[PDB]
Scaffold this active site. Sequence first.
Site, PDB file in Angstrom:
ATOM      1  N   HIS B  41       9.798   3.796  -0.287  1.00 14.03           N
ATOM      2  CA  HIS B  41       8.543   3.519   0.407  1.00 14.03           C
ATOM      3  C   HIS B  41       8.185   2.038   0.386  1.00 14.03           C
ATOM      4  O   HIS B  41       7.195   1.651   1.019  1.00 14.03           O
ATOM      5  CB  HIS B  41       7.407   4.390  -0.163  1.00 14.03           C
ATOM      6  CG  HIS B  41       7.007   4.063  -1.577  1.00 14.03           C
ATOM      7  ND1 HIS B  41       7.079   4.983  -2.603  1.00 14.03           N
ATOM      8  CD2 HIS B  41       6.501   2.931  -2.122  1.00 14.03           C
ATOM      9  CE1 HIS B  41       6.638   4.429  -3.721  1.00 14.03           C
ATOM     10  NE2 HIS B  41       6.284   3.182  -3.455  1.00 14.03           N
ATOM     11  N   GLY B 143       1.417  -1.259  -7.648  1.00  6.53           N
ATOM     12  CA  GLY B 143       2.568  -2.080  -7.915  1.00  6.53           C
ATOM     13  C   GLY B 143       3.431  -1.590  -9.053  1.00  6.53           C
ATOM     14  O   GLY B 143       4.493  -2.174  -9.296  1.00  6.53           O
ATOM     15  N   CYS B 145       4.974   1.217  -9.075  1.00  4.10           N
ATOM     16  CA  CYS B 145       6.096   1.964  -8.534  1.00  4.10           C
ATOM     17  C   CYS B 145       7.380   1.154  -8.654  1.00  4.10           C
ATOM     18  O   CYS B 145       7.368  -0.078  -8.573  1.00  4.10           O
ATOM     19  CB  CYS B 145       5.789   2.383  -7.099  1.00  4.10           C
ATOM     20  SG  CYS B 145       4.859   1.170  -6.203  1.00  4.10           S
TER      21      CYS B 145
HETATM   22  C1  LIG Z   1       3.910   2.228  -5.248  1.00  2.00           C
HETATM   23  C2  LIG Z   1       2.485   2.257  -5.774  1.00  2.00           C
HETATM   24  O1  LIG Z   1       2.174   1.630  -6.725  1.00  2.00           O
HETATM   25  N1  LIG Z   1       1.525   3.098  -5.068  1.00  2.00           N
HETATM   26  C3  LIG Z   1       1.974   3.834  -3.902  1.00  2.00           C
HETATM   27  C4  LIG Z   1       2.019   3.204  -2.668  1.00  2.00           C
HETATM   28  C5  LIG Z   1       2.444   3.901  -1.551  1.00  2.00           C
HETATM   29  C6  LIG Z   1       2.828   5.221  -1.681  1.00  2.00           C
HETATM   30  C7  LIG Z   1       3.281   6.000  -0.451  1.00  2.00           C
HETATM   31  C8  LIG Z   1       2.044   6.753   0.024  1.00  2.00           C
HETATM   32  C9  LIG Z   1       4.359   6.989  -0.874  1.00  2.00           C
HETATM   33  C10 LIG Z   1       3.808   5.065   0.643  1.00  2.00           C
HETATM   34  C11 LIG Z   1       2.784   5.861  -2.905  1.00  2.00           C
HETATM   35  C12 LIG Z   1       2.360   5.166  -4.024  1.00  2.00           C
HETATM   36  C13 LIG Z   1       0.116   3.166  -5.468  1.00  2.00           C
HETATM   37  C14 LIG Z   1      -0.809   3.646  -4.280  1.00  2.00           C
HETATM   38  O2  LIG Z   1      -1.201   2.754  -3.595  1.00  2.00           O
HETATM   39  N2  LIG Z   1      -1.292   4.960  -3.772  1.00  2.00           N
HETATM   40  C15 LIG Z   1      -1.168   6.382  -4.137  1.00  2.00           C
HETATM   41  C16 LIG Z   1      -2.543   6.996  -4.424  1.00  2.00           C
HETATM   42  C17 LIG Z   1      -0.294   6.592  -5.355  1.00  2.00           C
HETATM   43  C18 LIG Z   1      -0.570   7.175  -2.968  1.00  2.00           C
HETATM   44  C19 LIG Z   1      -0.040   3.687  -6.911  1.00  2.00           C
HETATM   45  C20 LIG Z   1      -1.229   3.508  -7.606  1.00  2.00           C
HETATM   46  C21 LIG Z   1      -1.303   3.970  -8.919  1.00  2.00           C
HETATM   47  C22 LIG Z   1      -0.187   4.568  -9.503  1.00  2.00           C
HETATM   48  N3  LIG Z   1       0.953   4.712  -8.841  1.00  2.00           N
HETATM   49  C23 LIG Z   1       1.030   4.281  -7.589  1.00  2.00           C
END
Ligand SMILES: *CC(=O)N(c1ccc(C(C)(C)C)cc1)[C@@H](C(=O)NC(C)(C)C)c1cccnc1
EC number: 3.4.19.12
Lengths: 305, 305
Positions: B41, B143, B145
Amino acid sequence: SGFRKMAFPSGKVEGCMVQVTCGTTTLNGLWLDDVVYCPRHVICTSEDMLNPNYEDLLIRKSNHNFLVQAGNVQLRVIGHSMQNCVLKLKVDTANPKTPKYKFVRIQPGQTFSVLACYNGSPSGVYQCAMRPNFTIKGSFLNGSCGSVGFNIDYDCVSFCYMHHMELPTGVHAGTDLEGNFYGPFVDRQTAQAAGTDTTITVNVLAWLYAAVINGDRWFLNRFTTTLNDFNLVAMKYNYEPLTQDHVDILGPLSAQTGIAVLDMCASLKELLQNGMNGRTILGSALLEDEFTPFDVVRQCSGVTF
Amino acid sequence: SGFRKMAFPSGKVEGCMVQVTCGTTTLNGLWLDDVVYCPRHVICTSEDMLNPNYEDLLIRKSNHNFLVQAGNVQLRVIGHSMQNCVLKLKVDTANPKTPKYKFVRIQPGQTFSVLACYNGSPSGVYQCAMRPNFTIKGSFLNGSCGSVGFNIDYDCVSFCYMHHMELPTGVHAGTDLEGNFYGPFVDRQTAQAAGTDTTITVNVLAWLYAAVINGDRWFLNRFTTTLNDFNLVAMKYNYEPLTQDHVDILGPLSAQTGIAVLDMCASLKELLQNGMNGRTILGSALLEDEFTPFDVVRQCSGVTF
Ligand SMILES: *CC(=O)N(c1ccc(C(C)(C)C)cc1)[C@@H](C(=O)NC(C)(C)C)c1cccnc1
Ligand SMILES: *CC(=O)N(c1ccc(C(C)(C)C)cc1)[C@@H](C(=O)NC(C)(C)C)c1cccnc1
């Protein structure tokens, strides 16, 4: 989101851990630049355990009585000296993995990470607080002495703890990296009891702020209190007194949550007076006091190193 | 003595964390040999989140759109490919710090260490369990992830988790290192049910053995029980059914402590039915289920890596 007991990444300290063997006794040492630091009781024998004459045992030892092993690399000791309760073995090689470091002496209530070690090799990492009674509730087995505690600010490791011993109660006692014991303890097998530990009030409050940040907010009430009235309550429940310094330290969390410190004090007062009623806060059924305000911020803000 | 939630030393993984940037979004990648692993992603943008067509989005990218930074050093991406939910950026350079490693898919109820990272830089390390419902209760901000979970066996790092997302529910979902999600989750911004969780019974029992080993024994009862009788209780309290396999896995702890597994179940049954009466087990007022029987043995035996 989420809140967990988080230790610093241990890599910078792992590259400093060595094994120190003097006669029959092996423990861990800290290799920084051309010096290895370790607890002085490495030069003890089982005979001297109850009351050793450390000056006597030392002056007789010479450089080749100390075996230092950094992984499979044997270091040659070219000097030795005793500073308080630590030994400083001068070695012929500066540690190529020496990080930017400082030695600091932490105050009660401050947290740090422990890299628990045996025979010079890392076993695991966990977070500790220096209790008010100057012990730590760690996880240390025989041979763990010489393991160290530390904080990391960007690239710089602040070493604050070296492990020396377990007390009869199962808590742990140690020195700063100058060899000075935290608390009134001494490095002999004697009658030394910790003393009544209290709860680190400023830390409980920080953790309550952490709870609010993560959406746990049931404990919040319609009451406020004063520092004096709250301190009366903290004293009855064996809590450290709260100072204006603690209040100032809590400003950042107060301004993020919009919750005044005295209002959170009123919440904590109700939680101390009525208990938790079988509820949980951040996944715990106890008031947790081993997160500093800096820990809460760092974990809710993402500071890296 | 003592017992703490202990993570593996993180050094071997720290030298593997890089920063991956594809257009606007930046996250963490895992650099092993000449491959950088990260959540696919990273190729999404604002408008793509609710239901990205990853095949299509990946097509619009080529190698030079992927900026990989290992420290201040830039890696040259020379090939890119999608494997399930992970991107695999082939780079100009094999990681010189690549530890011996495996990719493994762990089972629910197993634990691992998480090295939480931001911008390719490690910020902290903590231990957790893969819940029965294939989530983890972590500490992850935006961030984070790309941060990975892992175990170490002597010198081999077994990567088992890469973090992808927080469910609105507050728990965390991610994949193995082949990009297959644990649990039913998908990498899109959509509401997703985690499904009923359960307490990991074998781990609770392992932690009760740990407690006995450390001198907390007040909960040991004058009673016994049977696997089926215990399981009637377990199911009432949302506990995983205990199998003979779980019993056998507990054999070493039972042998060390001299307490038969079914006796400890009787202890656990009464804690479940009556609570703790404000007593603590290893400093906890809740029954802990994030220590495997191997975690306990490793901690109470001082296993080293
Ligand atoms: C990668 C990251 O930190 N994310 C995150 C971004 C984008 C996605 C998708 C929807 C799969 C493109 C997933 C996760 C954070 C985030 O912005 N949003 C959600 C609520 C997790 C979807 C995030 C924030 C806190 C903890 N992990 C991830
Ligand atoms: C260094 C170590 O692991 N010790 C230890 C040995 C010897 C001493 C003195 C009395 C200073 C000579 C102190 C500590 C372990 C140990 O053998 N004994 C006690 C219980 C600490 C006295 C040890 C065991 C568990 C945790 N820490 C230390």
